[PDB]
Ligand SMILES: CC(C)[C@H](C(=O)Nc1ccc(C(=O)NO)cc1)c1ccccc1
C-alpha cells in the first residue's frame with residue numbers, strides 16, 4: 001500500500017544525455033543512434049533570443065562549431081540540420097547505450113517523467129503532466145534546456161518532451177522530439193502568456209480511486225450524478241468536461257473498487273463545492289490531477305521494466 | 307525556476323538490483339561487489355512471519371537454496387550469513403556495475419530516494435523522508451521488500467534504507483544496510499504501532515525559503531519571534547522543536563534571501579495558527595516537510611552527478 005508521485009527509472013535515459021556547446025551557450029542533448037537532438041536556440045546569444053532568425057544564424061555555423069561531449073569523451077559531428085525547433089547533429093559514433101525507443105507527441109492530460117540535466121549530467125527525476133494549456137510545471141534552471149521527458153513500456157523508451165523555455169510566469173514550454181512546440185509557444189523571448197490552467201478531471205477521478213484502494217474513503221458519499229450535471233460543476237471550477245471516453249477509461253478502476261464512475265463523480269462534486277474541511281487525501285490537501293488512470297493501475301499493480 | 311519533489315537519477319542503483327528466491331518467497335536484493343544483501347525474512351513462509359526463529363529457520367537452508375538472478379542470468383551462491391535482519395549472500399562474481407558506494411544510517415528528518423522494485427526489476431523512483439517516528443511513507447506492494455533507499459553525492463551512492471515491512475496503518479519500516487531496523491520495529495507480523503508522526507520543522511522552513519526563491523511570498527509578514535516562543539507553538543501542532551543547530555543549518559538560505567530565520571519562523575507560526583485560507587505554496591495546500599535544507603540548495607542551484 002501507499003501511493004506516491006513516482007517517476008520511471010531513469011537509467012536508460014541517463015545513458016543518452018550529452019552536453020552540446022555552440023559558442024558561449026551550453027545545454028543538453030539527447031544521443032540516440034548516431035544523432036544528437038537539442039534545442040535550436042543553442043545557436044543564439046542572449047541578445048539573439050529577442051528576435052532570432054534561426055535560418056540566418058545557422059548559416060554561420062559549421063559542424064565543428066557544435067561541441068558535443070558524452071561524459072569526458074568528445075563526439076565528432078559530421079552533419080547538422082534543423083527540424084522545426086530542434087537541431088539534429090549527426091555524429092560518427094552510434095550511442096552504444098541506445099535503448100529501444102520511439103518518439104511520441106502526447107496529448108494534454110498525459111503524464112511523463114523528466115530527467116533534469118545540466119552540462120549533460122543528470123541532476124534529478126520527477127513526474128510531470130502536459131497541462132491543458134500546453135505548459136508543464138517543472139523544475140528547470142538555466143542550463144536545463146534539452147532535458148527530456150519520457151515514458152517507459154517494458155524495455156521501450158517513448159520520448160515525448162524536450163525542454164526549451166520558461167515563461168515569465170514560472171511555467172515551462174517545450175517541444176516533442178520532432179521539434180514542434182506543444183501549444184502556441186515559440187522559442188523567442190517575447191510576451192507569450194499561458195491560458196487557463198484547467199484541471200484534468202479524469203486524472204482527479206483516477207486518484208480518488210487510488211485513495212479508496214489505499215484506505216482513504218472519508219470522501220465517499222450517498223450520492224450519484226450524471227455526466228451533464230457533473231459538467232455544470234466542472235465548468236464552474238475550471239475542470240475539463242468529462243466525456244464518455246473518460247468514463248470508459250476509468251472502467252477497470254471502477255470494476256476493481258465496485259464504485260461506479262458517476263458515484264465517484266458525485267464525491268468529486270461535493271469536494272469541489274465544500275472543500276476538504278481541513279482533511280487530507282493520500283497526503284494531499286488539494287485534488288491531485290497528475291496521475292492518469294494508467295498511472296494508478298500501474299502503481300497499484302506493480303508493473304516493472306526490463 | 308519551479309520546485310518539485312525530485313529523486314536522484316536511479317541508473318547507478320538499477321544496475322545493482324537482483325531477484326532473490328528462497329522456496330516460495332521472492333523479493334529483491336542489492337548486489338554490490340561479490341555480496342547480495344536482502345531481508346532475512348526471505349527464508350520465511352507467511353505462517354512463519356507470526357513468530358519466526360530466524361536462527362533455527364536458517365539451519366535448514368544451504369547456499370543452493372538461495373536462487374539469485376540478475377536480469378536473465380543466474381548467480382552462483384558460495385556462502386551466506388545473517389547480519390542483524392539482513393542476509394549477506396556471497397556470490398562468485400563481482401557485480402561489474404558496482405558504483406562507488408557507502409552504507410549510511412540516516413537520522414530522522416533526512417530524505418532519500420527509493421527505487422521500488424519487483425522480481426528484481428525497477429518499477430519507479432520517488433523521494434522519501436525518514437519520519438521522526440522512524441517510519442517512511444512509501445509506495446510498496448507485496449514483492450517490494452529489498453527495495454533500497456539512497457542518496458548520491460557526485461559519483462558515490464550512499465545506501466541508507468532497505469524495505470522490510472508494512473504496518474497495519476499503511477506506513478513502512480525497514481533497516482539500514484547493516485540490517486538494523488530504524489526505530490523499534492521488528493520483522494515479525496505482530497502488533498507494532500507507530501508513534502506520533504511529528505512534522506520536521508527545519509524542513510518546512512527550508513521549503514518556505516524555496517517558495518520565496520521561486521516567487522511565492524504571500525505568507526511573508528511583518529513579524530518576528532524567538533526560538534522559545536516559536537517552540538511553544540511548534541509543540542501545540544506536533545512540530546519538532548527548533549534548535550540553534552537548525553537555525554545555523556538554514557543560514558545559507560537565510561543569506562541568499564535576506565530573510566532572517568526567526569522572521570521565517572514567525573511566518574510559519576501564523577500559517578499554523580491561521581491556516582492557508584484556501585491559498586497554496588509551491589503547488590501545495592499543506593506545509594511540506596520532506597525537503598531538507600540541503601535538498602533546497604541543491605535543487606535551486608542545479609548540482610549534478612557524474
Ligand atoms: C477547488 C477549490 C475551490 C475547492 C474548495 O476549496 N471549495 C471550498 C468551497 C467552499 C468553502 C466554504 O467555506 N463555503 O462556505 C470552502 C472551500 C477545493 C476542493 C478540494 C480540494 C481543494 C480545493
Ligand SMILES: CC(C)[C@H](C(=O)Nc1ccc(C(=O)NO)cc1)c1ccccc1
Pocket residue numbers: 278543577578579580581582591592593
Ligand atoms: C496544521 C494545521 C492545523 C494548520 C491549520 O489548518 N490551521 C487552521 C487554523 C485555524 C483555522 C480556523 O478556521 N480558525 O477559525 C483554520 C485552519 C495548517 C497550516 C498550514 C497548512 C496546513 C495546515
